[PDB]
Amino acid sequence: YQVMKRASEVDLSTVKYKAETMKAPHLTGLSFKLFVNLLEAPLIGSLIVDYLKKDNGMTKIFRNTVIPEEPMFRPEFPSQEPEHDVVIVGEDESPIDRLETALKCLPQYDPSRSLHADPVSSFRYWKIRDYAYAYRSKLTTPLQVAKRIISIIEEFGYDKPPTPFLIRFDANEVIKQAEASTRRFEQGNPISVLDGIFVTIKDDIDCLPHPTNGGTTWLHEDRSVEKDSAVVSKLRSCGAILLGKANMHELGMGTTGNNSNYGTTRNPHDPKRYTGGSSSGSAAIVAAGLCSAALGTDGGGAVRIPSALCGITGLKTTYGRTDMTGSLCEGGTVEIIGPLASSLEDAFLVYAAILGSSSADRYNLKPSPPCFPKLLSHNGSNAIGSLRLGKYTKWFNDVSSSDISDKCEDILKLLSNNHGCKVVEIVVPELEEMRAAHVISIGSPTLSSLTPYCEAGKNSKLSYDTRTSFAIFRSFSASDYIAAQCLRRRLMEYHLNIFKDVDVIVTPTTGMTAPVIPPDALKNGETNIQVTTDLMRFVLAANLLGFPAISVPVGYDKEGLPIGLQIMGRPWAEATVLGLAAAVEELAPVTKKPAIFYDILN
Secondary structure, eight states, X not given: OOOBOOSSSOOSSSOOOOOOOOOOOOOOXXXXXXXXXXXXXXXXXXXXXXXXXXXXXXXXXXXXXXXOSOOOOSOOOOOOOOOSSEEEOXXXXXXXXXXXXXXXXXXXXXXXXXXXXXXXXXXXXXXXXXXXXXXXXXXXXXXXXXXXXXXXXXXXXXXXXXXXXXXXXXXXXXXXXXXXXXXXXXXXXXXXTTTTOEEEEXXXXXXXXXXXXXXXXXXXXXXXXXXXXXXXXXXXXXXXXXXXXXXXXXXXXXXXXXXXXXXXXXXXXXXXXXXXXXSHHHHHHHHTTSSSEEXXXXXXXXXXXXXXXXXXXXXXXXXXTBOOOSBTTXXXXXXXXXXXXXXXXXXXXXXXXXXXXXXXXXXXXXXXXXXEEOOOOOSOOOTTTSOBEEBOSTTTSXXXXXXXXXXXXXXXXXXXXXXXXXXOBOOOOXXXXXXXXXXXXXXXXXXXXXXXXXXXXXXXXXXXXXXXXXXXXXXOOHHHHHXXXXXXXXXXXXXXXXXXXXXXXXXXXXXXXXXXXXXTHHHXXXXXXXXHHHHTTTTHHHHHSOOOEEEEEEEEOTTSOEEEEEEEOSXXXXXXXXXXXXXXXXXXXXXXXXSSOOOOOO
């Protein structure tokens, strides 16, 4: 009739791993179209929604389980111990000053990578300091790099359907921004290290002069943009060149990248496969080399998932670390804005430029001052070696393919052998309640902000993928929301006790590599829950609780498809997470060149 739980009075050895996937049929095309009309039906739709909601097990938790906890609406973490061996930069500092101190944490630039490249050598991505050195040594100009990029976009149709990396592009604006950056190098005074660097902005973030649509063809009618977002105003102040708006899953509701409205984005390593949602275009354009780095929103692993499936670095910062003002997901409790880059230097430098809490989140969350990890190996290089890499064996090998399990374990063995890290066995209880508490924690703020527009006769202007969840989200009652916030406090107390014994939690970012796109799904979408289950398996902890996670590319499988590793550290410990991932890519650099690659600067 009812179940009773607790958190403080819970044995650690009494919790066992439950590997039951959310079984749901896969409907594409007309069968998917008729299914959406069945969910929106008056009498039929309401009865069918409760049927699916009771099958997976989300009704037992919400309306048939007594909870002892108090609702934790936002991540509430206590003051943590200081990150050993870092540099504290000012919170109220400017992104120009923070980039200067960020360059002090990087090793000295070796011109042997750019100039005098050996004819027989391995493949490597063009870094940010490679672009900045060629700008200062008059090797190339940002105006020429822009013309070479626009030529690629207008040739392969990367700004055009049905395979668009971008859904909003202005060629005259890109040339105008590269023209202003060019004069700054000709006169001999660049703004910072980011001057002349192209960065793509996701379509759920405001960026002038382009409108913010978020994957729909109607949001610009009801939502207008007049100011740059908090992250764009920081990047534009550093001299960066905002390329355009990247393709994404519609309204950030997805984990594959399917967009039956503007066009689905293909994976650079295999165009017949997905990129990963919801930052689909923001991850492919970086993996293709067309730009240095890009920004994307991480609501439900929307940054780490596509970064792992494409073989690039995706950083999920702590909740409130990066000001979210001027985006579609502002006000949420699980969403952040993190950078996607080809390497870690680019992700570090971009992070140093956009890292800033808002005036509201500063008083509420009380963040510690930001810190940059000393990426210099000398003198000791033991600050990373003295770490407890906590991992859940039952929550590590639950991958659909065994290639990811062996490849990620080699990194743990390499980190333990070359640096002396200890792998401490941990346990993460109540993993089923995390998925149920998360889906309502993110769907409710998204549906509420779109409800006045959907009630305005514009609900039919959404994709069938979004309309599938909007009928599920519209059935979540207010009492179900309060019951989920109490679950967030339970999982907050578990993880905060986990961080007492370990420093980070190392797990694979996803449970599968890049999946092949069904040909029938390119018409109006799909609803394969088994695929989305394997992807959101390891990213929900950083979103529901607000912890800083990363997605460092570790290697490839037997099919040459990228594989990612997740490092989730203490609150406000981006320096600890970025420092460990720096040792990971040194033990496993990116070697394979994607099938869709473009080498600028030549």
